[PDB]
Amino acid sequence: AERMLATIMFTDIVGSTQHAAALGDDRWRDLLDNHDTIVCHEIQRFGGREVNTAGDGFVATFTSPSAAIACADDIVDAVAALGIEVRIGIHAGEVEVRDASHGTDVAGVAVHIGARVCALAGPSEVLVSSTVRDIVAGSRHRFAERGEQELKGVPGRWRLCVLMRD
Amino acid sequence: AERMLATIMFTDIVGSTQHAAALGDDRWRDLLDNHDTIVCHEIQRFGGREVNTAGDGFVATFTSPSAAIACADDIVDAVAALGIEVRIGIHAGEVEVRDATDVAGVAVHIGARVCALAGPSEVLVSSTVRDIVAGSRHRFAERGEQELKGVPGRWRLCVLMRD
Numbered sequence: 001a002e003r004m005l006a007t008i009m010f011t012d013i014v015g016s017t018q019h020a021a022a023l024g025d026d027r028w029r030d031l032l033d034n035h036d037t038i039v040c041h042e043i044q045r046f047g048g049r050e051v052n053t054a055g056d057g058f059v060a061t062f063t064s065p066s067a068a069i070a071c072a073d074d075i076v077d078a079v080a081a082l083g084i085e086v087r088i089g090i091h092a093g094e095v096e097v098r099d100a101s102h103g104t105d106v107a108g109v110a111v112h113i114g115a116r117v118c119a120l121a122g123p124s125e126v127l128v129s130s131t132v133r134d135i136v137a138g139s140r141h142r143f144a145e146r147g148e149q150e151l152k153g154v155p156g157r158w159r160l161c162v163l164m165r166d
Numbered sequence: 167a168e169r170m171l172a173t174i175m176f177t178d179i180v181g182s183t184q185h186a187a188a189l190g191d192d193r194w195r196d197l198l199d200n201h202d203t204i205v206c207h208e209i210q211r212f213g214g215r216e217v218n219t220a221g222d223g224f225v226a227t228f229t230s231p232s233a234a235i236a237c238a239d240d241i242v243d244a245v246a247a248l249g250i251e252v253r254i255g256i257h258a259g260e261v262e263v264r265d266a267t268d269v270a271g272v273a274v275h276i277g278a279r280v281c282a283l284a285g286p287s288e289v290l291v292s293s294t295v296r297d298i299v300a301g302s303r304h305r306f307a308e309r310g311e312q313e314l315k316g317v318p319g320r321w322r323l324c325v326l327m328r329d
């Protein structure tokens with residue numbers, strides 16, 4: 001492995017648990033396979049790379065912060081077409097790449113920060129660390145600043161920004 | 167090929183974020199790799215089938231609730247030998263079996279959730295799994311009624327008593 005700079009994207013179906021319960025396993029299952037084939041499609045489209053992909057959501061790394069943001073914005077719309085909303089979290093940082101000619105994985109506190117931003121993201125909302133915003137500054141993307149959302153005893157403090165889509 | 171009865175095991179490292187900070191990404195990565203070889207080995211040992219990551223953790227299905235419970239208690243000890251503790255959650259129910267091995271259904275969400283309620287080096291299970299192995303050597307202590315989030319009902323959770 002090597003320490004590499006990367007932009008990490010985390011996806012999560014909103015009220016996924018209530019959803020499965022209000023639907024039944026048969027329909028829930030079908031809805032899941034649709035979402036996965038969709039999201040996985042967008043990610044690959046925008047040159048992203050799926051890393052370990054966990055639960056009712058995904059995790060992917062992009063070599064371009066802009067791409068990752070474009071992907072996330074497109075995903076939010078493509079899944080809303082299924083009746084379900086997704087919440088997305090993005091972060092960028094160096095990470096240990098447990099890479100492999102298959103399911104190449106990643107690890108480091110950067111990964112935990114991403115996952116943590118995803119959890120704070122609202123329905124059909126793309127949330128990102130101020131880190132992600134500063135580093136694409138100069139691009140067409142714009143964001144609104146939420147403020148400081150102290151993260152699970154993580155060293156320092158973090159501000160989060162919502163991508164203003166359209 | 168359809169709806170199947172299964173015992174699902176969810177594992178997760180306790181305070182995996184306090185450990186990475188304290189270790190630094192380099193060491194955290196190696197450890198993580200040791201843990202994964204260990205857990206994955208126990209699961210395979212006890213005939214389990216990984217429907218594999220719960221991020222910093224695993225998810226596996228067993229055709230025998232007893233086996234799954236024996237795998238989980240062995241795991242708790244084998245990882246404590248690395249300096250880190252795991253929390254484990256078990257549940258049993260029918261589940262939708264599928265593609266891209268993977269499983270799905272509200273039973274998976276229930277498991278994933280009695281894992282999050284599990285303490286360090288603790289094996290937590292739904293009253294559902296205590297009930298299905300009643301008659302075996304395993305014993306449990308009852309926590310009471312929890313309102314597992316997003317879930318209908320109000321479940322009773324039980325702690326596996328280990329030596």
Ligand SMILES: Nc1ncnc2c1ncn2[C@@H]1O[C@H](COP(=O)(O)CP(=O)(O)OP(=O)(O)O)[C@@H](O)[C@H]1O
Pocket residue numbers: 012013014015016017018054055056219220225269274275278279282315316
């Ligand atoms: N196949 C799978 N493998 C591992 N985990 C899975 C999984 N399917 C679902 N999950 C679980 O789904 C849960 C993740 O949190 P969410 O799914 O976002 C519930 P929530 O955070 O309460 O959303 P909500 O507030 O909209 O109800 C985790 O417990 C996760 O491990």
Ligand SMILES: [Mn+2]
Pocket residue numbers: 012013014015016017056
């Ligand atoms: Mn969810």
